[PDB]
Amino acid sequence: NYAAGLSPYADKGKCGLPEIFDPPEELERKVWELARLVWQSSSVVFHTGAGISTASGIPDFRGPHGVWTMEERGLAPKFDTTFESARPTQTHMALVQLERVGLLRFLVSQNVDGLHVRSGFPRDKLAELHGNMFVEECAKCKTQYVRDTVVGTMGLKATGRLCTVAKARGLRACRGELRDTILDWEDSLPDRDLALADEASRNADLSITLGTSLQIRPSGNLPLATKRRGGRLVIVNLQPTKHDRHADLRIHGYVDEVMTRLMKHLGLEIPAWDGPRVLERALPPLPRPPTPKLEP
Amino acid sequence: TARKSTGG
Ligand SMILES: Nc1ncnc2c1ncn2[C@@H]1O[C@H](COP(=O)(O)OP(=O)(O)OC[C@H]2O[C@H](O)[C@H](O)[C@@H]2O)[C@@H](O)[C@H]1O
Ligand SMILES: Cc1cc(F)c(Br)cc1NS(=O)(=O)c1ccc(NS(=O)(=O)c2cc(Cl)cc(Cl)c2)cc1C(=O)O
Ligand SMILES: CCCCCCCCCCCCCCCC=S
Ligand SMILES: [Zn+2]
């Protein structure tokens, strides 16, 4: 799998732990608590990882049939679908809506699947901390390029294409080297994107992690800064995570299900997906919906 | 310089 040019010197972390499932009684009880917590909280940051794209047929890294998990035990990973053909999940779409109605301040993602951007989620409210298969970036001028198809390298290599930006004075092409945005093991995170995520998570008062085992830093430690500054922390993940001890609420369920219940408890529709819609800037906020009902 | 790793 790192015949794709990447480092074989990586700490894959703890792979292949067994999946816990909350029984359906305790789940419903818990998701209700989350819904109250969302509505009740002013600034709410979400943290996504590979676990929210599993439903679309993209494997996780450290699950029972994760990429690293399978490599670590001598086996070919198993891809169901491609990155192009992969379709946003209920969670991807629920997240989109939660932004539209101001119930989500910021989104922090470790996923390189490109599907947050393709879900329609506004890029200016998203830090893609480990990169995006579809985004390439000019080395000279920093300008990014969201593509229809993958840029075709990883590890911050050059993709063999040049920057088409014509500059303010002169207006002749920049012609810098375009490179992928996919971080390799121990590559530095993106300055802008980490800064915004860091700020978002400090000043957030609810952090909700969805489908990450929280083993890779600094990404996986941002949800903790929320707590150190007096906030709450919800951890939605099937497996246990590295920071389970610090969670105000752990939920061990499918993330599509949790969000599906959450959006009902908040009385909100989960959009369908028309197809890939790159949205650079968030639209004007919709008005905040009716107050949630209490538990029946 | 904030590197993607596991820290150990
Ligand atoms: N439907 C689901 N609902 C809830 N959890 C799920 C589901 N499907 C899988 N999971 C859980 O989701 C969790 C996924 O954990 P990991 O596989 O470590 O992914 P990461 O994003 O945290 O890894 C971070 C970086 O590491 C890599 O090197 C890349 O650079 C990554 O960006 C598991 O515990 C699953 O049980
Ligand atoms: C549709 C397409 C056009 C291209 F030009 C290129 Br490159 C790839 C694709 N397919 S893709 O979906 O976007 C796609 C993108 C990235 C990877 N990388 S990977 O999973 O780490 C991987 C790396 C290596 Cl060296 C071997 C294997 Cl078998 C898998 C795989 C696929 C794929 O699933 O085949
Ligand atoms: C975001 C979900 C992607 C899961 C499918 C696996 C795609 C291969 C991703 C390899 C990207 C290189 C990851 C190295 C990151 C440094 S440890
Ligand atoms: Zn340029």
Side-chain angles (χ1 to χ4, degrees):
Chain A
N1 201 95
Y2 16 93
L6 307 178
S7 183
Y9 295 101
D11 185 29
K12 293 322 196 183
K14 188 78 201 195
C15 296
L17 293 178
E19 293 183 324
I20 300 157
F21 295 81
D22 282 356
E25 184 163 31
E26 200 189 3
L27 190 99
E28 286 304 320
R29 217 203 82 252
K30 280 171 165 171
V31 181
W32 269 119
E33 167 72 306
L34 175 52
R36 178 161 64 264
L37 284 158
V38 168
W39 177 259
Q40 182 183 307
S41 296
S42 75
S43 180
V44 174
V45 171
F46 281 74
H47 308 256
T48 65
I52 77 161
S53 281
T54 61
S56 80
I58 296 171
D60 48 1
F61 290 101
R62 308 188 178 77
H65 317 107
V67 183
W68 304 160
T69 309
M70 299 272 273
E71 283 189 7
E72 178 166 295
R73 310 203 200 175
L75 295 161
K78 195 196 312 201
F79 264 53
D80 295 335
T81 85
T82 59
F83 281 126
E84 277 84 342
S85 82
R87 295 186 67 267
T89 80
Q90 296 312 118
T91 313
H92 282 80
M93 297 311 325
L95 284 164
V96 158
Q97 193 65 44
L98 283 156
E99 189 281 321
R100 295 297 289 107
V101 305
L103 286 175
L104 187 157
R105 179 65 47 74
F106 201 66
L107 182 57
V108 189
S109 182
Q110 289 161 291
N111 293 330
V112 306
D113 37 55
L115 300 204
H116 275 314
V117 167
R118 302 151 76 71
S119 74
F121 194 98
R123 294 189 71 214
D124 71 333
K125 285 178 159 230
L126 176 55
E128 274 174 324
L129 294 183
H130 298 166
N132 180 336
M133 290 301 285
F134 297 86
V135 175
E136 55 189 335
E137 182 191 299
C138 170
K140 180 164 280 148
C141 79
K142 266 59 176 162
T143 284
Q144 294 191 332
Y145 286 76
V146 182
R147 307 312 201 175
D148 274 313
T149 59
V150 307
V151 304
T153 64
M154 305 181 189
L156 314 184
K157 295 176 188 56
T159 70
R161 278 188 290 262
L162 299 123
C163 180
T164 75
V165 169
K167 291 152 282 183
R169 182 187 59 184
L171 37 101
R172 177 66 223 127
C174 163
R175 315 208 68 75
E177 199 165 66
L178 297 190
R179 291 162 180 181
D180 70 75
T181 55
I182 304 305
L183 298 189
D184 207 348
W185 170 254
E186 294 194 318
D187 278 332
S188 280
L189 266 66
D191 264 311
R192 166 168 199 74
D193 291 326
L194 178 53
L196 299 179
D198 190 277
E199 159 154 302
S201 297
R202 264 141 161 72
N203 308 323
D205 54 58
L206 175 64
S207 269
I208 300 162
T209 74
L210 306 179
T212 171
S213 62
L214 299 173
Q215 297 201 57
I216 297 286
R217 81 192 184 181
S219 341
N221 296 330
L222 296 174
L224 295 173
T226 305
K227 257 194 81 100
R228 190 226 301 141
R229 314 255 295 193
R232 311 269 167 73
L233 178 65
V234 182
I235 295 184
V236 181
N237 202 60
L238 281 174
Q239 286 172 336
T241 81
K242 184 145 180 286
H243 305 319
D244 280 338
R245 77 186 65 180
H246 306 288
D248 294 56
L249 163 62
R250 294 168 288 286
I251 306 176
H252 295 105
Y254 289 96
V255 74
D256 273 22
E257 285 191 42
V258 167
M259 296 308 291
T260 282
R261 307 320 209 287
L262 177 61
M263 296 295 280
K264 300 228 77 218
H265 302 342
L266 286 156
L268 289 175
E269 303 299 338
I270 287 169
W273 183 68
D274 293 318
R277 294 296 201 287
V278 174
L279 172 54
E280 288 280 328
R281 307 278 175 186
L283 305 179
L286 297 188
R288 219 151 164 284
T291 301
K293 276 134 195 173
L294 312 180
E295 212 161 337
Chain B
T1 308
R3 292 178 210 289
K4 171 169 177 277
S5 81
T6 61

